[PDB]
Design a protein around this ligand. Structure first.
Ligand SMILES: [Cl-]
Ligand SMILES: [Cl-]
Ligand SMILES: [Fe+2]
Length: 323
């Protein structure tokens, strides 16, 4: 399978060397344009085999709309305890930030949203005490299936998750479900419903004090046989009864066809957010610094499209127009 790639020893050693040099020698820090520029240049030093694998995935993300690469460099012996605060982000140069931002520049460009993790390009995904029931990074309850930032016009094209520390408890796993697997299984009425403009996905309160009551829109987008989708099973509200039934059937088939991944250190999951939803199983964190630790970076395949939301042609998307 070209969607599960283990680095051979030589390639893993070359990537480690490149990542260390970037992390230690590049001027500035990960969120600075000059550091992203260094990562972009560093990406082109990677082994050609890996660049070819990623280019292949970008061109065709396959029936599960996801790839896992294994054997990437993480400083396990140097890793501090897993962070325990909401909004934990990687502001300082590190091996993890190097790996993520280099890969981001290979697939497109990294990006982030000002109202989410303060627009940090490399974001920690860790369980936070008191946030157990929360539908987000910090929770440890069941995270229902969603496209990342489904409400947003310039939502991530890819979501990348690098594992620094595995969940020691064995109950946590990333779940990904692709529309390619479910579409041929869906009943005709459900398919019709999903193409109809009968679903409202409002932005979360963090993204606006508020205004424009979101116009109803379809869940399925683009080609009839190979559509994209835009859904959040927590946030998307059906406007009609048939839309409600359709979401229930959609969820059922996501659950039935989802791939569940327990990531290990040095493993990088890349999800095609145009065709694949993700979620996470419930688990019981230890909250003792040994818990699951992933770092996340979003990729925009055509950064240019979001320029109106990126002051100074930066990597942080805000808002506006207005009139
Ligand atoms: Cl490209
Ligand atoms: Cl996992
Ligand atoms: Fe998510």
């Amino acid at each position: 399978s070209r969607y599960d790639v283990t680095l051979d020893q030589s390639d893993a050693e070359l990537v480690e060397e490149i990542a260390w040099k970037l992390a230690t020698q590049a001027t500035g820090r990960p969120d600075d344009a000059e550091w992203v520029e260094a990562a972009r240049n560093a990406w082109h030093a990677w082994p050609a085999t890996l660049r070819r694998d990623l280019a292949g995935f970008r061109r065709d993300s396959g029936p599960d709309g996801a790839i896992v690469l294994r054997g990437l460099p993480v400083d396990s012996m140097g890793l501090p305890p897993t962070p325990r605060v909401n909004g934990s982000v990687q502001r300082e140069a590190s091996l993890g930030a190097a790996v993520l931002l280099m890969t981001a520049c290979g697939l497109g460009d990294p990006g982030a949203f000002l109202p989410e993790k303060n627009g940090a390009l490399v974001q920690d995904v860790v369980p936070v005490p008191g946030m157990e029931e929360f539908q987000g990074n910090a929770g440890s309850t069941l995270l229902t299936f969603h496209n990342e930032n489904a409400f947003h016009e310039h939502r991530p094209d890819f979501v990348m998750l690098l594992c620094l520390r595995a969940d020691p408890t064995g109950r946590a796993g990333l779940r990904t479900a692709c529309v390619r697997r479910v579409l041929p299984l869906l009943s005709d009425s459900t398919v019709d419903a999903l193409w109809a403009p009968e679903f409202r996905t409002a932005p979360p309160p963090s993204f606006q004090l508020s205004g424009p009551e979101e116009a109803p829109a379809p869940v399925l987008l683009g080609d009839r046989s190979d559509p994209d989708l835009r859904v959040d099973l927590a946030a998307t509200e059906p406007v009609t009864e048939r839309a409600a039934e359709a979401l229930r059937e959609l969820q059922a088939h996501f659950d039935a066809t989802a791939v569940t991944h327990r990531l290990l250190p040095g493993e990088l999951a890349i999800v095609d957010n145009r065709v694949t939803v993700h979620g996470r199983t419930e688990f019981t964190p230890r909250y003792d610094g040994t818990d699951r630790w992933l770092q996340r970076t979003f990729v925009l395949t055509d950064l240019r499209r979001s320029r109106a939301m990126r002051p100074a042609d930066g990597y942080v998307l805000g808002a506006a127009p207005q009139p």
